[PDB]
Design a protein around this ligand. Structure first.
Ligand SMILES: O=C(O)CNC(=O)C(=O)O
Ligand SMILES: [Mg+2]
Ligand code: NI
Ligand SMILES: [Zn+2]
Length: 331
């Protein structure tokens, strides 16, 4: 069995190997990469996403989100308070202001220590989930707006044609902006490219051990767990590496830098934080190996999770017994 300890693997594809996206995902899996829940892919030196980032300031962040924490430093939830619209140039200036800028630090480990000690005492503002892309149309390799669609994969594997679309999303971050513990919608893969700026630190639980994280979360967030049998789908709960280690939860960590891709694998729980002003692009995708995960994915039906249009068909076809309850939660 490849990668039996479920370590995060880092790949360096050649320019030739960077041509065929699906084939390379399957290669990484042949080496056991998926066992970790997360892999890093460093693009060949010949590749670029676009020519420059000098002209992005006029992008609008219609609904910046202030991420307000409640709890204790290592075990907390966050809620998202909506703020007035601002441009990426305005948001960049805000991120670099004295109130929001990254503190002085020695190295990534020192900054991680400071994040977990102090996160809850601040409310950073995140430009998340903005439909759009920063890949040049002429970038042919690993262009996240030109991937095969999940609807097409489902149709190829199972024969059923479905409605829906699959487009990328931009994320503008600042110091302490946080992504809560989650798997993807329908336990899909995700791919995330860090276009520019400061790093992103990731934590991940191997898919084979995801239920250990779920059981801890039910213990640590007992009101939330009574409210909803899949409350991690709400994407609000944080648990620190120290708390995970105290509770024996298997996990790994890695820091992504600008110019690097990360892939999350089906049912790989992940969480993390941004080091300073940055911009990432991410999208969900599927492979044949996903279908069994999609059929077994938990679902939130309490009303909180609310998701895209395109998840309807995935539930309807892969999980017909659950469909009527889930759709009520959507309505
Ligand atoms: O970068 C972020 O805030 C969160 N991204 C992801 O959870 C992802 O790419 O799957
Ligand atoms: Mg612009
Ligand atoms: Ni994710
Ligand atoms: Zn719920």
């Amino acid at each position: 069995a490849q990668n039996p300890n479920c370590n995060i693997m880092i790949f360096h594809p050649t320019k030739e190997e960077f041509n065929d996206f699906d084939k390379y995902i399957a290669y990484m899996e042949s080496q056991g990469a998926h066992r970790a829940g997360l892999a890093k892919i460093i693009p060949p030196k010949e590749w670029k996403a676009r020519e420059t980032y000098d002209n992005i300031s006029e992008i609008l962040i219609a609904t910046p989100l202030q991420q307000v924490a409640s709890g204790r430093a290592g075990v907390f939830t966050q809620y998202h308070k909506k703020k007035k619209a601002m441009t990426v140039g305005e948001y960049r200036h805000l991120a670099n202001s004295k109130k929001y800028q990254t503190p002085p630090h020695q190295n990534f480990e020192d900054l991680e220590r400071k994040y977990w000690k102090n996160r809850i005492y601040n409310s950073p503002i995140y430009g998340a989930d903005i439909s759009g892309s920063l890949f040049d149309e002429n970038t042919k390799q690993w262009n996240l707006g030109h991937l095969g669609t999940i609807q097409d994969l489902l149709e190829k594997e199972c024969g059923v044609v479905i409605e829906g679309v699959n487009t990328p999303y931009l994320y503008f971050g600042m110091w302490k902006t946080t992504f809560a513990w989650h798997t993807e919608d329908m336990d899909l893969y995700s791919i995330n490219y860090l276009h520019l700026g400061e790093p992103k630190t990731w934590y991940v639980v191997p898919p084979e051990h995801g239920q250990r994280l779920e059981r801890l979360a039910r213990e640590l967030f007992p009101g939330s767990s009574r409210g909803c049998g899949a409350f991690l789908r709400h994407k609000v709960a944080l648990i620190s590496p120290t708390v995970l280690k105290e509770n024996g939860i298997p996990f790994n960590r890695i820091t992504q830098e600008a110019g690097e891709f990360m892939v999350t694998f089906p049912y790989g729980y992940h969480a993390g934080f941004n080091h300073g002003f940055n911009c990432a692009e991410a999208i969900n995708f599927a492979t044949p190996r996903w279908i069994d995960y999609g059929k077994m994915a938990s679902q939130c039906s309490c009303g909180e999770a609310r998701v895209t249009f395109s998840m309807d068909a995935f539930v309807r076809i892969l999980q017909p017994e659950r469909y009527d309850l889930w759709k009520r939660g959507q309505d």
